[PDB]
Amino acid sequence: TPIDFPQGFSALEPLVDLPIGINITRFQTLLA
Amino acid sequence: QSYTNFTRGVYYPDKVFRSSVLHLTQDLFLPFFSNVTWFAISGTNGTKRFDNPVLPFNDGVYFASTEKSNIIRGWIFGTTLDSKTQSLLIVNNATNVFIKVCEFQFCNDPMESESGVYSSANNCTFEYVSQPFLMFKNLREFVFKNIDGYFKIYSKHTPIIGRDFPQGFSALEPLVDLPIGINITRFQTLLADYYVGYLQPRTFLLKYNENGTITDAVDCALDPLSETKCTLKSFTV
Amino acid sequence: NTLVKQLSSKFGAISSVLNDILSRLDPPEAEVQIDRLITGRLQSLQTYVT
Amino acid sequence: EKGIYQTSNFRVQPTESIVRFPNVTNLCPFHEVFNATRFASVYAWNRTRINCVADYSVLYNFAPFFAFKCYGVSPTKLCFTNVYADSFVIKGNEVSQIAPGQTGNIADYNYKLPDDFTGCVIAWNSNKLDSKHSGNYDYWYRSFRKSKLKPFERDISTEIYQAGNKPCKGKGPNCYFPLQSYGFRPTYGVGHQPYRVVVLSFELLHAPATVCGPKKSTNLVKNKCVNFNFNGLTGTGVLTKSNKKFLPFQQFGRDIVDTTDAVRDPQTLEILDITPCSFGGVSVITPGTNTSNQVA
Amino acid sequence: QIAPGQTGNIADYNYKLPDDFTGCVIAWNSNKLDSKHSGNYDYWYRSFRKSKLKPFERDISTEIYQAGNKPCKGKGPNCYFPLQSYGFRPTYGVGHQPYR
Ligand SMILES: *[C@@H]1O[C@H](CO)[C@@H](O[C@@H]2O[C@H](CO)[C@@H](O)[C@H](O)[C@H]2NC(C)=O)[C@H](O)[C@H]1NC(C)=O
Ligand SMILES: *[C@@H]1O[C@H](CO)[C@@H](O[C@@H]2O[C@H](CO)[C@@H](O)[C@H](O)[C@H]2NC(C)=O)[C@H](O)[C@H]1NC(C)=O
Ligand SMILES: *[C@@H]1O[C@H](CO)[C@@H](O)[C@H](O)[C@H]1NC(C)=O
């Protein structure tokens, strides 16, 4: 969204579907 | 022989408590006023020491006796009853009711000085003991049903005043339900004045009390009034 | 009372209790038996409302 | 628009589930088979049956099983309607050969196992009982037999392999005697050492359906909305003290519309009424979204 | 067992299809290629797992599963390797022959 949060409504589109097949209980965010 | 005017043999079809309701159910019951054979023929000495008749077991049977002597000791249920097939033997005692299911070639009884010797048994698989512990004049009513592999025995013992079959309604409570799994087509009465009837598919309207007992019953196909009662599900029309 | 009594009807199913159907049968067969019970109960509701 | 609207119904959910079954009776004689003074032979096999009330955690705790494989789910204690337990003591080279479709010298001449049976074969080190190396009487199987056996061939009928340069009747020159020390003599104490082996088929499904695994019971909870299972009768409701007088053989009760309203506790025999958990419709009262968003 | 709604050691612990499944399951008798005379032990099956398998999940852990009341490291009396190999041979019956 290229236009703080204006609170305008928007919706997401499908991007990718990966058949990983794993439990995925937890996650981390990777930063440089 | 060929006794009739009987209106007894209703038993609790299940183990469900009901309070002040009229329950219409279809099950195997002794029909009211059906023909019941009175066993003269095998009374007292009868044919004892010489023969002993074998009766068919069609779906289930009704058995009743008033003999205080306890001459009646048990029953054998099965088909061949000669050790070729598996059979069920029920024998009563003073303090031990014993049920054994296995192949038997014969039992003990084919004056009354000795009993309980038996003969032989082999490859026996099922035994069950003392459901009621025990089993001055009393009427002892039993119903023997064999459905879906389960052998269901119902019974009731009530006092009498010396009359043959005192009148009033009394339903038979269940006694024992065993997963025997055998084919029963014939049975025989063992003696060391009994009545035998047969159950048929019927619809009955059973009247339950406040305390869960059955106090009356209507045989839905006995007469047009009973049929009306089942249509309305009421004892008052 | 009739509508409640209809819950005990099998409508051709092996049992009237959904938990029994789910416990003894694999999902596929349970789904067939449950769908049958659903059809019978919907028919009973349509009769009641009509 | 302004008005009162009918929305989704509400329920009061249960907070916990309770399972009640009657007091557990005596257990299957598995302990006598494993915790034996002397182990049984192939011919002296047992047939566990009927207050069997099977419970397989006792075998997991009793002995250090090292080669225990279950064709059905080894963890599940479930049903069978029969348990056809069998036992024998065998060298730890042939234990792996006690399986469907396997041959070797064993099974072909001892205890052939059919395909498609719940072969829950179990085994553990027997050196503590066969500590003397001379040879022990208690658990001899059949090391050799004249001809290949059918699945579940009779073990009660034993024989001596009729090998020779002339017909052999059982014992004789160049015939193989099943009672030579064989496996029972440990020697090294690993490998060939005799292993106590128990195999229960669990494969007889028939009309009675009797023996099955112990049914656990949870504590009883009253005066709360709970889920319940009483001897297979399941539901959701609030359990309260009953004033109903059940007969000695009645387990539950019903209303005029054939719904369940009471149960008999399998362990205490207290009669409990089942009150449904509260529910009802939900109505939303609104001035309408063109005036105010406040609702009731 | 390779079908929607089925149970067993593979349907439950190795490979499970969803109940709502669209697709095709093709099987072929491979006994002449996969079964070795001495036994082919390259193929492993899971028999011991704590939880049941969820649809199309592929869990390849080999951690020891303990069935007793005391965990242990390595192999142990109630400590089992989760996989069991199967030694396919040309002499096994059809039920026990390998299928692709
Ligand atoms: C088996 O059932 C009996 C009841 O028939 C249980 O015995 C009762 O246990 C409570 C405590 O939980 C006592 O307050 C009662 O006085 C006991 N009554 C009798 C008659 O013993 C018993 O706990 C159940 N379990 C076992 C293993 O026996
Ligand atoms: C995905 O991972 C979670 C977390 O490890 C698994 O949940 C565990 O399941 C076992 C099964 O007995 C429990 O003993 C653990 O306590 C659970 N972990 C908790 C509660 O944190 C979950 O089972 C995994 N999914 C699958 C399909 O195996
Ligand atoms: C039910 O039992 C109670 C026990 O006190 C008794 O008072 C009552 O009269 C009984 N009712 C019937 C119909 O037997």
Characteristic terms for this protein:
part of a larger assembly, 5 chains, 32 residues, little secondary structure, 0% helix, binds a molecule of 2 linked components (NAG-NAG), binds 2-acetamido-2-deoxy-beta-D-glucopyranose, Spike protein S1 (chain D)
Instruction: Give the C-alpha Rg of chain A.
Output: 15 Å
Largest sheet of chain A: none
Task: State the oligomer.
Answer: part of a larger assembly
Distance between the termini of chain A: 23 Å
Protein name (chain C): Spike protein S2'
Coiled coil (chain C): 1-34
Organism (chain C): Severe acute respiratory syndrome coronavirus 2
Describe the structure in your own words.
- It is classed as viral protein.
- Keywords: SARS-CoV-2, covid-19, Spike, viral protein.
- This is part of a larger assembly, with 5 copies of chain A.
- The two termini of chain A are 23 Å apart.
- Chain A is extended.
- Chain A is largely without helices or strands.
- Chains in contact: A-E, B-D, C-D, C-E, D-E.
- The A-E interface holds A 19, 21-23 and E 56-59.
- Bound molecules: a molecule of 2 linked components (NAG-NAG) (2 copies) and 2-acetamido-2-deoxy-beta-D-glucopyranose.
